Symmetry: D2
Subunit: 384 residues, 4 copies
């Protein structure tokens, strides 16, 4: 289960670089130089790294300092072969964003948020990023009157439309991915789930430029089925990117290493991604727990990739197993993939076997055989 | 706080008619004749009733029995002035639907589900219903392999597209409303939230025919902010109908009377519905707790309407209060409603006050004054 | 992974016998004769069965009918070698219990509840049960004023104290196990978690007669860590019985087969039970999903046992692995088991190395190496 | 609704002093001098303040610096009349506590944790505190193998037993209150609920010295009914202290101002506290949202007290209302308070009206009238 750059595993600078500050505790780890993280991640078999602007260039940096930070980073990329497939903007850490970036009540903040984003889009394109992620972590509210959500969605649409106009005007070959999260750090975050983000995208001026960057743990913070949400994103043609991690149910955003948290959901996710031929980066947005020293950081990052590869093997073995293929037919997964009424509406209406002569009791008595199928899945997951 | 038919309060037959059977207990109340529920609800000030096909016509009824059940119902409507603004299909109670209706793995069940739906659409139109609700309570899964969600969404789209073709072909002036629910009775239900349903609608052949019928408790079963979800539905122009009830957080679907559960969310919901001028029925999908006898049933139904009317008064007083209007300006809700960059992208890019000369620290120091605003909201809610 | 009666796997009659009625659907399976379930479970390798009174003897049965039902059951036990290690009372299905049994507001219902319980205690003892489970599924409330919880706890204590007096007065060698559940079918259930039940037991007149019967899914309905709760029950010496099943997070009580739901929690549970030498029955309180026919029922029941046995193997391999034993030392699990201050309070107070001369920064820099340990656990779970 | 020191409202220094650092953002507010918070809180009508050691004395302070910080604080208390009813230890912020204080795997850390606690107990007693709170926020785990919970409970018991020995040996008139929290900042925290803490206390050497300090939001992070948990704590005689705040369901610990979050739960809490004659401090453990400037901080703190006082008025009006008193009798709350079987076990067994002659159907048909009662409660809450 050794990862290669072929597997397209990517990590955010902020992931292995998380110093371990949480709402109740100081940092337990010193800051990592991005150059060192690139080197270490390349040694582990990562394909690339991702960054917020403020991960790479400290907020408030001069243009010459910005120059220097990028050149050092680019040299590390050249030295390692690491790619930068995705970049994003930090519109959540600085106090100015305390009420949001794109949907801050203050108009001048929203304008600043856009300008900060645009500057990093240019850098992202320069570094070869194909996807630009937007996580509006501060877009939302703790109280009902603070945020008229219709106005805020107007502002959110306006911001994304202007970004789309910007990338079009520049001829950039980059697409946007909206990363939903239901809550934290705001009491409720706008576009809280994959579904809300998908629906929002359809109201943008150029919907083709926008997809979703769902995160395992974020959908699970709403108790939702992450593979189901990913399937809907795939069905819509909008799975531009994905954030992999672990989460133990409905609580604060844990960002455990991938495979931790809901392991069976991870299995079904990998099954779906591989079956659907998802070709984008397998990006880990995780935090090595603050209990860990730097050896634990790299162990946790390695485990992200290891668990993906183990689940990939098990999911492939599951789907390739002739006994499973028979069980899938026994459960009529093949019939699910057949049109209900390719014969059309009138033929359906005239079809007495569909209603007047339909034996509802004989159909009702047919067991779905889902439990045998699921135990085969369990056996495959466990290597049993 | 006396409701009138003007207030458009509607109730499902299955609500006050719930006999109190839950997963662990037998019925505590005898069945209600729909005619009696119409009469009793009219006496309480309801505007109308809604029904599943199987609420009104017992499953398996002959055409003559169906005739008789409808005529008796129509006479009660004529006797009371009650309307039927919405109807829906029971595709969840009968064992034949144990794996779904529209997305059952068995093709013959999916065809039956459509035929059962179409027959009730005709009846709905005959009775004057403007909205036809679809709650796919059995569409989903308990295990990952039982349901290929992409195929299931194909089947769901196919079903809704055929229904849209049917109503168009018939010239019916009826629209569809998809009612999301995250789980229960399936382990996960497809289209689990308002967002997922809104996104799905955009992939239908005639999206204009479809909106959402969100339910308070259902979004709260995912820990989501129901007023936020309603605002997004309104923003999309898709709030065709709404189900009002109460829910105490993330657990089984309680269907408490409206105002029970999350009371402040109910306040903000009423505020939003009234502010946005939502003109559809205020429909209660609730269950009088099985502790109650029939007097408790009507008390609970009356309380649904009473609580809406109290919250409506309090929300109106909140918005009309000049001190609140000043607080809203203090929190810059007015600025939220102003375009971020009506001057356009180039003007934004050339605007040094938006970035180079933006004083981020002075902007960051501005308090949002949300807590004063929210306490005014609290004072208004409590009549303090 | 073939179960034997040695493994002490037990099943409730109501589990494989669940007809599949849920809040939104009719039964999908015919009733099972308890005699057939005993036979079928014995064939699968079960050790025994458990029952509510009303599972075995239909409510309202005459004494001669009761006689006949028990004799038939006893013959099936004799025919199969199956034991009955646990019995319990149905104080939740009949409408009379709609507000509880032991804590119903109506005094006459509480007296009936006790008499119904006592009659089944006699039968339980006759059939050889060692543990008598109490699941107060109806003890609770949907609204705040319906139930004064202090009075209800008084009534609950009174009921359990009288049951303890009864078994003592009769010389019965049976102990009681309180089964907590946070909610469903009541909006909130009294004694909602293992902790609340453990705390309550300490206020009973004869605490030694009472322990807990925690259920995997029930603690997970509160988002709690089930192995942690079991560890506290073991630490208290109160793990008299355990209900094994699966649950996908905070939602309605799914009662999935064991190993489904949170698989890693199942691993850590089995690890703990086996490490602690828990010698009681491994009881499955699960429901074969109503999608299933009877073949699916027995497949699901078999999978309960299979998954326990697989996890048992993996947990044993984990603990036996010298690399894991080294990792446990690296994470200082050995130091956790050493007393903090066996030298006593005064020695601690005089120990300058414990404070004045304690190098907090050197201690803080020590990584816990938990992530390497957890990935070894993952590798062992997955057979990697 | 003006608070007076009579109302015993207390605030932690860390509450109004929270600088607004959250997992995704920097501080939005400058640090508050504790002297200024005491002054400002006294002006608002607070009765007193509480503190962690590290709130009052910066970690690493010299004895002379510690001297100075305490003297300045004591002068502010003398200047304002403010009391310090409760103190606690910060065993969670410093990196040394990353795996816990009392249950850290490292023995030397556990010894340090105790010594740090003992030093602050002395200061607490000097300042007049009656209750010493222990919130073991770092006691727990993110992974199953990191923490043997039985060993950890041994260590937790050992620590609390040594603290009890210490206060006894010193003759201090102070009691301990364990503050449960289910999770955050650890993935799972030991003693996660009021129930677990109550059960744990019963295993301590001197249980009479220990009670619970439940927090509204913490129990609601497990989806539990906070008034129910408080009632059990009162029933056990263990409600030594209480932390009041608001929480919107199962998510990260919001620490909203009291009355925010679940408003009806706040109503029922106040009803219970006032009805039971709880005489301890009404302590607010809340965080003014980081959107706020200092005016918003004091507005939020004032709203804590205001909402308590409004709910107190409404709960008193509810209980004093003769129509409610009649409704309580209609729902048989009076019968709930009567013993089930004061006549004793034998009389119960011989009572044919309790079983053989009990009319279960007539009892079952009696409505509980809970919905009318709850709507009266709603009307009273809303001032309707
Ligand atoms: Mg995350
Ligand atoms: Mg992410
Ligand atoms: Mg519902
Ligand atoms: Mg509904
Ligand atoms: Mg259960
Ligand atoms: Mg159970
Ligand atoms: Mg808190
Ligand atoms: Mg607290």
């Amino acid at each position: 289960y050794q990862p290669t750059p072929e597997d397209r595993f990517t990590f955010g600078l902020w992931t292995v670089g998380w110093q371990g500050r949480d709402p109740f505790g100081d940092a337990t780890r010193r800051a990592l130089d991005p150059v060192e993280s690139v080197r270490r991640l390349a040694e582990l078999g990562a394909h690339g790294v991702t960054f917020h602007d403020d991960d790479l260039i400290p907020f408030g940096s001069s243009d010459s300092e910005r120059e220097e930070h990028v050149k050092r980073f680019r040299q590390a990329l050249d030295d390692t072969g690491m790619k930068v497939p995705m970049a994003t903007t930090n519109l959540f850490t600085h106090p100015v964003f305390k009420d949001g970036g794109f949907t801050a009540n203050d108009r001048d903040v929203r304008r600043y948020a856009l300008r900060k984003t645009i500057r990093n889009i240019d850098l992202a394109v320069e570094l070869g990023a194909e996807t630009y992620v937007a996580w509006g972590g501060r877009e939302g509210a703790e109280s009902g009157g603070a945020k008229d959500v219709r106005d805020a969605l107007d502002r959110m649409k306006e911001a994304f439309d202007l970004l789309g106009e910007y990338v079009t005007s520049q001829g950039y070959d980059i697409r946007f991915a909206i990363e939903p999260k239901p809550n934290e750090p705001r009491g409720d975050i706008l576009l809280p789930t994959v579904g809300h983000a998908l629906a929002f995208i359809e109201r943008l001026e150029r919907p083709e430029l926008y997809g979703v960057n769902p995160e395992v743990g974020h959908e699970q913070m709403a108790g939702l089925n992450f593979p189901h949400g990913i399937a809907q994103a795939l069905w819509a043609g909008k799975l531009f990117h994905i954030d992999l991690n672990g989460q133990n149910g409905i609580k604060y955003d844990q960002d455990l290493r991938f495979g931790a948290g809901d392991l069976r959901a991870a299995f079904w996710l990998v099954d779906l991604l591989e079956s659907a031929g998802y070709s984008g980066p397998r990006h880990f947005d995780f935090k090595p727990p603050r209990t860990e020293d730097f050896d634990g950081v790299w162990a946790s990052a390695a485990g992200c990739m290891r668990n993906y590869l183990i689940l990939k093997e098990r999911a492939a073995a599951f789907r390739a197993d002739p006994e499973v293929q028979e069980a899938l037919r026994a459960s009529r997964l093949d019939e699910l993939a057949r049109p209900t009424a390719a014969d059309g509406l009138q033929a359906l209406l005239d079809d007495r076997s569909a209603f007047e002569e339909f034996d509802v009791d004989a159909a009702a008595a047919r067991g779905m055989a889902f439990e045998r199928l699921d135990q085969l899945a369990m056996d495959h997951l466990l290597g049993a």
